[PDB]
């Protein structure tokens, strides 16, 4: 969540943009495919195993 | 891996992408690195691609 330069995109922003672009591409091309989004390093937890 | 197993359809491909900027997530703890390597090897054996 730190930006090296004032006029630059943080790593999180670039990751989110890439995920959204891939989602749109999948919707347009193959809508029957499966996608998921997970986060590691957060404070909260939500999973079957309760890690 | 648990998320992959939950799917009930037939999966031609299984892929994971890791968005990170920390080349040494586990440098203080060597055991954690060994566990991560073992888990990655198990995932590769199961047929899960890692990027």
């Amino acid at each position: 969540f730190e930006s090296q330069s004032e006029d630059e995109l943080t790593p999180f922003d670039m990751s989110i943009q890439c995920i959204q672009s891939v989602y749109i591409s999948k919707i347009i091309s193959s809508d029957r495919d499966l996608l998921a989004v997970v986060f590691y390093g957060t404070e909260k937890d939500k999973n079957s195993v309760n890690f | 891996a648990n998320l992959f197993s939950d799917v009930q359809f037939k999966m031609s491909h299984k892929r994971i992408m890791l968005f990170t900027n920390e080349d040494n997530p586990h440098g203080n703890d060597s055991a954690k690195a060994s566990r991560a390597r073992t888990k990655a090897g198990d995932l590769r054996d199961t047929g899960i691609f890692l990027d």
């Binding site: 891939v22 591409s25 091309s29 193959s30 | 031609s12 491909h13 892929r15 990027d51």
Partner: peptide, 23 residues
């Protein structure tokens, strides 16, 4: 394998359309 699409496996990454480019 080389030049493979990262969105749709099993298909080659189609290049962007360039239209007409005079020599």
């Amino acid at each position: 394998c080389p030049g493979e699409s990262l969105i749709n496996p099993g298909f080659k990454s189609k290049k962007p359309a360039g239209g007409v480019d005079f020599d």
